[PDB]
Design a protein around this ligand. Structure first.
Ligand SMILES: NC(=O)c1ccc[n+]([C@@H]2O[C@H](COP(=O)([O-])OP(=O)(O)OC[C@H]3O[C@@H](n4cnc5c(N)ncnc54)[C@H](OP(=O)(O)O)[C@@H]3O)[C@@H](O)[C@H]2O)c1
Ligand SMILES: NC(=O)[C@@H]1C[C@]2(NC(=O)NC2=O)c2cc(F)ccc2O1
Length: 315
């Protein structure tokens, strides 16, 4: 099936288009192509600095009647410098304005770490450390709950939350809405079995980010492992007459995950959508799971000192 049911009773497309690092001069055409070929979920964020250009694409395709607003599933995220109760609404509203939407289908707390508010996304002290916010995740969650009750967003969720942090929200006194989604890094080198099982056990849908191992990540190094070039994964793809990327996308789909590969290349945008026509075997799935090495693309390395830094815990 192409959509998964969320605990808010809305349906979410299991395949979306990622937009981190998509250049502003290329992302409007990328999102136009993606909607033309069938994508109905766009993953965005204010920190990516391209929401205006994403929005231009969405609005044109609504105008052209290629799609209806109800058929789209648009996702954005609250940056770390906006965890303050009094800043959350304006951050959401700026995203809405830029995307030229009147609601978001899903708004996520981007990280459990809150940072000092201000112009800088990574505010630093004179010694180079990121300056934190004294706001805690539970008060940030209540501010997200307000957004639902104001009609700005249909669902709220979290991202890069470890199992104890998810539990902290689930156990929040006075909890009004559970998180619908936990968006986390997930691919054959970081298979996340524990955190996924916990989230699914609670009714929280997991979205897999960097599913191709983010080969365009700014800090990539030639000696890092490469999913797209892994000959073991290439061999599974060849067996199935699909590309390696297509296997990497289908793999989380069969774990009941949502997945959000990024591309600004039209050919690849289309390739990446052609994953509803084949099935990996259970053996294939277990083999791909065996490649785990707890290798992370996104570990927020500039702020491992934060109280709420998520990746010291084992999961
Ligand atoms: N919540 C968070 O903290 C968080 C963190 C990281 C990512 N995310 C989200 O997850 C999305 C996906 O993760 P990501 O951007 O890190 O990386 P990714 O989707 O794993 O990999 C994107 C890279 O793969 C290339 N690529 C795409 N399709 C390909 C194909 N079929 N064959 C060969 N290469 C292909 C892209 O190139 P081209 O673009 O040149 O075609 C780009 O260089 C992000 O864009 C963002 O929306 C969220
Ligand atoms: N270093 C990290 O782990 C994160 C990753 C990350 N990419 C992403 O999609 N979400 C993120 O937060 C990102 C994006 C940025 F625009 C800037 C920094 C940045 O850092």
């Amino acid at each position: 099936a192409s959509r998964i049911l969320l605990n808010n009773g809305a349906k979410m497309p299991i395949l979306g288009l990622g937009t981190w690092k998509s250049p502003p001069g290329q992302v409007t055409e990328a999102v136009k192509v993606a909607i033309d070929v069938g994508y109905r979920h766009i993953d965005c964020a204010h920190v990516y600095q391209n929401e205006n250009e994403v929005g231009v694409a969405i609005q044109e395709k609504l105008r052209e009647q290629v799609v209806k607003r109800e058929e789209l599933f648009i996702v954005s995220k609250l940056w770390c410098t906006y965890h303050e109760k009094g800043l959350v609404k304006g951050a959401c509203q700026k995203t809405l304005s830029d995307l030229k939407l009147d609601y978001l289908d899903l708004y996520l707390i981007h990280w459990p770490t809150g940072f000092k508010p201000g112009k800088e996304f990574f505010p630093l002290d004179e010694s180079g450390n990121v300056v934190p916010s004294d706001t805690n995740i539970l008060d940030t969650w209540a501010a997200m709950e307000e957004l639902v009750d104001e009609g700005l967003v249909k669902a709220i969720g979290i991202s890069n939350f470890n199992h104890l942090q998810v539990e902290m929200i689930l156990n929040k006194p006075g909890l009004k809405y559970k998180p619908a989604v936990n968006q986390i890094e997930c691919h054959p080198y970081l298979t996340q079995e524990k955190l996924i099982q916990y989230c699914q056990s609670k009714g929280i849908v997991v979205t897999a980010y960097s599913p191709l191992g983010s080969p365009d990540r700014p800090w990539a190094k030639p000696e890092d492992p490469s999913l797209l070039e892994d000959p073991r994964i290439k061999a599974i793809a060849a067996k199935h007459n699909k590309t390696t990327a297509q296997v990497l996308i289908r793999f989380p789909m069969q774990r009941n995950l949502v997945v959000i590969p990024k591309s600004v290349t039209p050919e690849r945008i289309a390739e990446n959508f052609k994953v509803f026509d084949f099935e990996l075997s259970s053996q294939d799935m277990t083999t791909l799971l065996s490649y785990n090495r707890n290798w992370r693309v996104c570990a927020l390395l500039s702020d491992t000192s934060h109280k709420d830094y998520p990746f010291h815990e084992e999961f």
